[PDB]
Symmetry: D2
Amino acid sequence: RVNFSLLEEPIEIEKATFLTIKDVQSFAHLVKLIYQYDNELKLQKGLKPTELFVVTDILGYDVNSAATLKLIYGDLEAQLNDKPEVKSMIEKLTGTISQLIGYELLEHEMDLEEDGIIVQELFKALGIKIETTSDTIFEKVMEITQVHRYLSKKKLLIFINACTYLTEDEVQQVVEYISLNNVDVLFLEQRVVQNRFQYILDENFYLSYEKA
Amino acid sequence: RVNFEEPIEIEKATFLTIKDVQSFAHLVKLIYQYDELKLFDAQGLKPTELFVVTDILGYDVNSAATLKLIYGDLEAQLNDKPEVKSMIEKLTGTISQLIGYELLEHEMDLEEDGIIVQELFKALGIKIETTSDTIFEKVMEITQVHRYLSKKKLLIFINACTYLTEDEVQQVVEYISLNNVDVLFLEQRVVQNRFQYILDENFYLSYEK
Amino acid sequence: VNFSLLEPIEIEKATFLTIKDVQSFAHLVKLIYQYDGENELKLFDKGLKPTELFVVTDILGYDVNSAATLKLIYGDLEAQLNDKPEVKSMIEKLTGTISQLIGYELLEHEMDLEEDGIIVQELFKALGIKIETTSDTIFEKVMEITQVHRYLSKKKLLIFINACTYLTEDEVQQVVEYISLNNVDVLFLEQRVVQNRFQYILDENFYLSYEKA
Amino acid sequence: RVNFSPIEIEKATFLTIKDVQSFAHLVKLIYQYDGENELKLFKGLKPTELFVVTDILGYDVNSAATLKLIYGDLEAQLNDKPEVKSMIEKLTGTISQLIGYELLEHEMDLEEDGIIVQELFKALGIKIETTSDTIFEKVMEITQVHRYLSKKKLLIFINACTYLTEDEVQQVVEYISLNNVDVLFLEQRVVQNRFQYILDENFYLSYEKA
Ligand SMILES: [Ca+2]
Ligand SMILES: [Ca+2]
Ligand SMILES: [Ca+2]
Ligand SMILES: [Ca+2]
Ligand SMILES: [Ca+2]
Ligand SMILES: [Ca+2]
Ligand SMILES: [Ca+2]
Ligand SMILES: [Ca+2]
């Protein structure tokens, strides 16, 4: 994954790549570009607006949206498909509940009818979601990265200012996760992230791949 | 129970025929307009306490407000069969445990609440069966549903008795008696072989046969 | 359009069908309400989707002012307006003037405000444009349902059940009079004979005939 | 106004937290605001009285409840310019009648009520413009929105000053002091050239000019 704007040199986003932009205006501008994304070019084949995933507000980000739960539930059912001895138990438990309640409908004085219970119905009845209420920014960053692991239509996650919140070993565990799961993410910072390699465009317009 | 040209007393299944079509139309209008024509208790009826059907097969017996009342009642019936409820409680508990393990094995921080019996009712698709209904059956169903909707003091059917054999009518008239529900049947053709208020072409109020 | 259930009766314009036996009247009503295409009632052209069918028993209760009906009526209403261009341009010029004025008000306001335009539909919707139904008689409502049947091109067959029990002999004529004018196929289904007109009849012993009554 | 996890929020007030773990911890505390570990006082603040932004450009300024309030103010404005209101009502009036005849000649029994200004604003899609915003511009708009929502007693911007030059912050602060609202700027690095509370690398609170 490749982008270019004012640099006149293409930056390469492979796994977890850090881009620090010292001058606030140029940082405000690249940020504005990222939200207006459509100038600013993302690649070979140009990225579709819909394949970009941007977060600035880590805690406000809704990770339990309707679409994301759909995939999670899809995978949970799959996982449970591969454990026939468990799926089996579940089926017999739900079957029994249905016979049981079935009887009640009969003894009920109106003309009652039922279908049955499939696993998705169970996921929905259980209130299955990602836990977020007790999240630290670190725990949440991780949760956002994993949703990205899943959202295979989302080609690039850009974090903005996310590092201003994390301790240095915290940044390393996020990187280790991104490395290990073959996803690509850009951290866009205005202040240098300590003890690692990063692109830096400095107070003047000198682009370098230094370290801190 | 009391409604009014002359005051009429509605209790169990009562029949009102109007043979002059215009005055039948006019009354049916007034029935749909209700808020001019006045309906009383033992000594004032609010619109939400009145309930009307012309389209017997189209009426949704499975509407959410009614499904609530049946579910409530179905749960009460569970509650009063303590060994059965306990069986269900532990079976849904066991499910919640199993799925909960699966949550732990899944890579993300996953959470679940629990399964209560109303959720089971909604997951099974508990409703009143209607697909196979005959007009006759649907009238029976609608009538029961009238026993439950006790904020609905009076039920009016219009032209029901044109769909129904004189024997079905009597079934229904009885069934209504066993539930002590007040329902008015408004017709335009006399209902054969029974006592009905009649308002004839020449506007004479009769209690005939 | 055509039905068989037992043989076949063409329904062209305002056509009446009296089923004199109550068992059979009820059976057929059930068939209509259970209509899908795979089941035992058959309605033609050949073709006829359930989505294309349109049945009303309860007339006062029918919602003539639904969103999907109103979209069609507004559409017609737009066209009637394009057929009188001097009125049309006056509307465009008058909404134009509106938009400029409110525009200047967006400029003078502290905040950075933006508008787009007013198009006729938006005017219809701001006008509370609907069919008046509060004061309806059954007769009046029956006209409106017929009228709405006409504008819904997707609805090929309208069916009224027991409509003639609320309607005087004069009133019936006019519905038929309207129906013919507009080339819409509506079937009136009855249990009693309709006074003084041509109908199909199924008698208590199941002979079908086409008679005045 | 008053803050503790003991700080007085008045007009434009900045609070810098130097240890990232503290910062993180407080930001989280802000997103959980109920009345638990940290507290905001006039008497307590309800969570609907609170108003936090981190994602400036993402923030929906054009929400149904905010628009409600602009429209009322726009309407108020209109009413105060009676020559204009009078022109608008004539225009809507004439339109009403033209369509009026068209309904009378329509075959169906067609009915209309009328047009009031609020409906006018709605058919226009009156909204705050944001597609072209810079972060600065958006920051002004949100500050404006805060000025309309009497209900939110406090606005908290987090990391706002990583996107803003010294001169722009200064324009934001001029605006706020002037329209007199309470907005807290929570940062993790010192904002040049102004007074701000500072939490040291623990645990000392001081109120200096940087
Ligand atoms: Ca089910
Ligand atoms: Ca969590
Ligand atoms: Ca639950
Ligand atoms: Ca049934
Ligand atoms: Ca518009
Ligand atoms: Ca009317
Ligand atoms: Ca209006
Ligand atoms: Ca703007």
